[PDB]
């Protein structure tokens, strides 16, 4: 995309922590930049609409490289992020408001460096990475998520020279569910053969997709969480086309460059459900803030090791809470990510290990060595209505069997529409982030 000159963009001041030993920390001078999708697209020498509603504008974007030409991406300016994204800093806390009201619906953020022209790319190998969160606002159907993923620092530009934003103006989303839904890849508009999604007033679908390997941190709302990995072959961002982005809608889900499930220990779904919860008897009391802590554990303990292990624990009101183990006859009572922690819950499950396919903790760590971007949003889900995190999925199977329950949701619950006025005014909160060696950050 070109940049447009309506307004500047200005990002939001974070600042984290950088870490050496517990409670010895430094302040790193960060910000928050909005996802390109969330931008104004206008005429590049007016104020014409190049997309409106879910539409692309048919006279200037008949094709990708003509869109591309007449068309250029706006700034955030400071007074708009409150105002019209939702988005507001108060020290170290970053809040984003769901539904901002000219409406605004969900919001996807990335974390700049200190110079504010490219990310701040996280090597997480042998690493903790840990912040404080509030999802008490968040009921079914909401996620509140914070991920890693392999974008490029520069969002692409010094690839596609027609980017001409950059990480500045938060291009180059890509993600392991290859989403066809971004609206700017590989430097130009991805308006061939866009179709609006029905029941998304704001969103639709192009001819390609964006993928990349992706490490969930954190996917949740009050009522469930989880962790994932999605490693891809190759990790680094990827168009795609066809059979490569392994669109659902053609049965390709698991023909695709990456790993769409993941391999996901959510504490719920491997069958504690007192883990986690919106009330002061749950082991962890989703109805106040919290610190979420992730190791990064590798096979030597160095940081030219293999990934092996993606640990987890909590710490709320100063109580440390270790993780939730896997609850089934027969199965070890894993408490973490590993290769074999996710060939034992996807064979019990019933579940393709796609994970596996490719390349296990070994690709994931790959993508974490190389350096990964910092994803902080909220969403609702209009494919699948956040079933797949809170409740019973598929909605027909039965509960008991291994795999199907991940919350206590109805499987009516997470219709857009209904989210979209009953938690209006949800917002996610995180803050304090810090990041370090093994054992440093709390």
């Not at 990827?238 to 220990?265: A, I, L, P, Q």
Request: hydrophobic fraction near 30%; charged fraction near 20%; glycine fraction near 10%.
């Amino acid at each position: 995309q070109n940049v447009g000159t309506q307004a500047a963009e200005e990002p939001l001041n974070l600042p984290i922590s950088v870490c050496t030993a517990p409670g010895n920390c430094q302040t790193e001078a960060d910000a928050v930049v909005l996802d390109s999708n969330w931008r104004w697209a206008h005429t590049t020498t007016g104020y014409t609409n190049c997309y409106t509603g879910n539409l692309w504008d048919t006279t200037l974007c008949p094709t990708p490289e003509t869109c591309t030409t007449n068309c250029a991406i706006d700034g955030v300016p400071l007074a708009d992020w409150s105002g019209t994204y939702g988005g507001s800093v108060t020290g170290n806390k970053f809040n984003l408001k769901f539904v901002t009201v000219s409406t605004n619906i969900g919001a996807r953020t990335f974390l700049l460096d200190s110079t504010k022209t490219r990310y701040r790319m996280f090597q997480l190998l042998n690493r903790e990475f840990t912040y404080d969160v509030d999802v008490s606002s968040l009921d079914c159907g909401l996620n509140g998520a914070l991920y890693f993923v392999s974008m490029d620092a520069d969002g692409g530009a010094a690839k596609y020279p027609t980017n001409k934003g950059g990480a500045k103006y938060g291009t180059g989303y890509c993600d392991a569910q290859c989403p066809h839904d971004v609206k700017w890849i590989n430097g130009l508009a991805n308006s061939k053969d866009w179709t609006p999604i029905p029941g998304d007033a704001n969103s639709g679908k192009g001819y390609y997709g964006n993928c990349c390997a992706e490490l969930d941190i954190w996917e949740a709302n009050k009522q469930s969480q989880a962790f994932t990995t999605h490693p891809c072959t190759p990790n680094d961002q990827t168009r795609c086309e066809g059979v490569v982005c392994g669109d659902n809608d053609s049965g390709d889900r698991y023909n695709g460059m990456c790993d769409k499930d993941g391999c996901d220990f959510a504490s719920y779904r491997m069958n504690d459900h007192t883990f986690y919860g919106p009330g002061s008897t749950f082991k962890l009391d989703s109805t106040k803030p919290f610190t979420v802590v992730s190791q990064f554990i590798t096979t030597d303990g160095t940081d030219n090791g293999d990934f092996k292990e993606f640990r987890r624990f909590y710490v709320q009101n100063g109580v440390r809470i270790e993780n939730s183990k896997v609850n089934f006859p027969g199965i070890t009572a894993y408490d973490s990510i590993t290769d074999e922690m996710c060939a034992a819950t996807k064979g019990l499950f019933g579940d393709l290990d796609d994970h596996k396919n490719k390349g296990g903790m070994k690709q994931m760590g790959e993508a974490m060595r190389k350096g990964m971007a910092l994803v902080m949003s909220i969403w609702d889900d209009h494919d699948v209505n956040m079933l797949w995190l809170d409740s019973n999925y598929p909605p027909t199977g039965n509960p008991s069997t291994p795999g199907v329950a991940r919350g206590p949701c109805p499987t009516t619950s997470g219709v857009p529409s209904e989210v979209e006025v009953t938690q209006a005014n949800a917002v996610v909160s995180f803050g304090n982030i810090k990041f370090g060696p093994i054992g440093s950050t709390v």
